[PDB]
Amino acid sequence: AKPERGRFLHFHSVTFWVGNAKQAASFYCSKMGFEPLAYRGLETGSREVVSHVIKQGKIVFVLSSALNPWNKEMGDHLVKHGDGVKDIAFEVEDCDYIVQKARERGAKIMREPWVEQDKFGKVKFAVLQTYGDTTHTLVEKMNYIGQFLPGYEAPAFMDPLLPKLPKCSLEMIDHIVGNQPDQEMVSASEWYLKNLQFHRFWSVDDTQVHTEYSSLRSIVVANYEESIKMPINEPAPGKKKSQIQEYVDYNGGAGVQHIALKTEDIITAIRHLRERGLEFLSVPSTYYKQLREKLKTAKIKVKENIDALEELKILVDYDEKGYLLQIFTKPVQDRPTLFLEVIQRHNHQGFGAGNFNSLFKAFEEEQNLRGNLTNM
Ligand SMILES: [Co+2]
């Protein structure tokens, strides 16, 4: 059923709470092909919080830290989670309706709709509490023509190394995954259905995604127009500990496990990301032998050179109409929590259990190296 009013247009931005915003922004710019977009801090009159905002295509990351000793909210979050996603922002139409509807359905409103303004126009915001300590910020632009948002100025520094690095060709945020503790997948996903009038887009249980040792369950929620997709995972039974449970152990609770970034040229993207020193998960040579064999009878034709995919360790999955190319980075911090994915879609707007399985297996290999694939 189509929601009466309101519309979630798309992912607006992801906000990270990190120990060192300056160095985090440098990491994402140099290693992942982002560029400075905006800044707030002591020099712009923001005296409690510093934010470095960076962008690639439509992808916008906000890296924020506390400026003062003993910041309780940001300090606690940092100690509990380490560097990680705090907020997922959605650009919306009719923020007021969305908030009112969410409130009536029982969502916790961390911040009532307020409006900010600069010379480029007005923006209305609201903040809702989702799983764990993660929030959603709703962004409604009211004839706003700025490059980002009110309260942020031009970048503090334009790193002269950046233009000398190869372009990574990342275009937009494709989906964002939230890991939940044991038995909280349903309640976490229902939150979207009930409060935001999302619907169930896809799901897998532990009989569809598992290795010889561990498994998960997942439900993907999506907005009506399906421009926003968010897999919600929980651990599931196995001889050994699910990687979802490893996440929860190290995150101290529910939170965002990965952000997938879409590209229209994944060969170029991964080659350039590797040249910049980004690390990715690995896949055995046998996978590509089996892949070539399977493609002989497939209804689709993969256009990327398989040798290149194999070289770059890109995973392939397909249905009868199209295919998906996906790859995970290693975690972007030392705790095995947050990582990133690069995805290219070819006439395929969903997810594939094939890739979900291979990715799950590729990640479980690293969980084992961390000594956390332990018997249950
Ligand atoms: Co993903």
Side-chain angles (χ1 to χ4, degrees), residues 1-3 5-57 59-121 123-166 168-288 290-298 300 302-376:
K2 184 163 183 190
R5 275 170 58 166
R7 181 176 177 190
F8 296 76
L9 299 186
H10 49 252
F11 290 111
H12 174 267
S13 56
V14 181
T15 295
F16 300 71
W17 278 7
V18 300
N20 194 332
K22 182 183 290 197
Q23 290 185 9
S26 182
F27 183 85
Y28 290 103
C29 291
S30 65
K31 293 255 173 276
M32 306 205 59
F34 283 81
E35 288 175 5
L37 174 62
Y39 173 79
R40 69 173 178 180
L42 294 176
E43 304 86 353
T44 71
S46 179
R47 299 194 55 87
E48 283 69 61
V49 179
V50 52
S51 296
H52 294 256
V53 185
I54 63 186
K55 84 171 318 169
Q56 185 173 176
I59 310 165
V60 174
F61 286 177
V62 181
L63 293 308
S64 293
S65 305
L67 280 169
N68 305 126
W70 306 114
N71 180 304
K72 178 161 192 54
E73 189 177 23
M74 302 190 67
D76 282 9
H77 192 280
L78 187 58
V79 171
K80 177 179 176 179
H81 300 277
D83 282 16
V85 173
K86 168 65 197 182
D87 186 278
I88 294 163
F90 300 125
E91 194 171 331
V92 305
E93 290 174 6
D94 203 344
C95 178
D96 290 315
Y97 166 84
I98 291 155
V99 174
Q100 191 52 50
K101 187 68 182 183
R103 180 184 286 116
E104 289 169 357
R105 291 277 178 89
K108 180 173 182 179
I109 313 306
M110 303 311 275
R111 270 200 75 172
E112 313 291 329
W114 78 98
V115 172
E116 290 184 11
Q117 176 170 40
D118 58 21
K119 71 163 172 176
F120 296 110
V123 181
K124 183 180 302 195
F125 297 104
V127 184
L128 288 62
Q129 181 68 50
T130 180
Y131 47 78
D133 292 313
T134 307
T135 61
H136 291 301
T137 299
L138 308 182
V139 179
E140 183 170 20
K141 293 184 182 187
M142 302 179 284
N143 303 294
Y144 193 76
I145 68 176
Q147 304 174 62
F148 184 58
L149 293 176
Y152 299 80
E153 304 295 329
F157 176 60
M158 300 298 286
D159 189 340
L161 179 64
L162 300 185
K164 301 200 145 63
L165 301 181
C168 298
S169 200
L170 305 185
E171 301 286 347
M172 68 187 69
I173 295 164
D174 180 86
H175 60 272
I176 299 181
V177 174
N179 280 351
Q180 313 301 322
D182 180 50
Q183 283 190 281
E184 295 184 26
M185 173 183 72
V186 166
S187 66
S189 53
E190 281 308 315
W191 186 93
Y192 291 89
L193 270 51
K194 175 172 69 77
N195 303 330
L196 299 193
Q197 306 187 276
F198 278 25
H199 60 281
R200 238 133 135 143
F201 175 82
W202 195 64
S203 64
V204 289
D205 60 33
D206 48 293
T207 68
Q208 313 174 264
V209 178
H210 63 88
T211 63
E212 349 192 85
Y213 300 127
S214 67
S215 65
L216 54 65
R217 283 180 290 257
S218 185
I219 291 178
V220 181
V221 299
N223 64 326
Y224 188 76
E225 303 78 8
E226 294 178 352
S227 57
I228 291 167
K229 300 192 198 83
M230 288 184 294
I232 302 294
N233 297 332
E234 71 178 3
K239 187 186 187 266
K240 302 184 190 297
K241 167 176 298 187
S242 176
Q243 59 199 240
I244 310 303
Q245 182 64 52
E246 181 193 35
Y247 176 91
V248 168
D249 298 341
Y250 284 89
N251 194 51
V256 174
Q257 176 205 58
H258 77 262
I259 300 164
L261 305 177
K262 187 171 72 180
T263 178
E264 307 303 334
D265 190 345
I266 195 165
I267 299 301
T268 295
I270 303 314
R271 195 179 68 241
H272 289 173
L273 285 164
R274 282 179 192 279
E275 288 179 26
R276 291 175 173 244
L278 197 61
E279 278 191 273
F280 295 87
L281 300 188
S282 191
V283 179
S285 296
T286 55
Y287 172 92
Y288 296 96
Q290 296 172 316
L291 172 63
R292 294 173 200 268
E293 173 68 16
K294 290 186 182 185
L295 287 174
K296 286 167 181 177
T297 54
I300 59 89
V302 173
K303 285 82 184 186
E304 288 80 3
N305 192 279
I306 307 291
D307 303 327
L309 295 178
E310 172 164 11
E311 169 73 9
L312 298 169
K313 306 177 201 174
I314 293 159
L315 292 165
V316 182
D317 193 3
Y318 53 90
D319 61 8
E320 303 223 310
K321 295 182 198 75
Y323 62 99
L324 298 173
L325 308 174
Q326 285 171 282
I327 190 178
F328 283 175
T329 71
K330 285 189 184 188
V332 297
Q333 64 293 293
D334 299 288
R335 296 193 200 190
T337 50
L338 179 66
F339 56 93
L340 294 143
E341 162 188 348
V342 177
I343 175 168
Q344 176 163 1
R345 299 179 167 280
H346 285 285
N347 280 315
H348 196 321
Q349 288 297 119
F351 295 89
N355 267 5
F356 206 157
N357 269 288
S358 303
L359 292 165
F360 187 90
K361 171 60 174 65
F363 191 94
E364 175 195 82
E365 157 79 20
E366 308 284 323
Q367 175 189 0
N368 188 45
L369 296 177
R370 294 184 290 266
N372 295 331
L373 187 64
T374 49
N375 285 319
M376 292 275 89

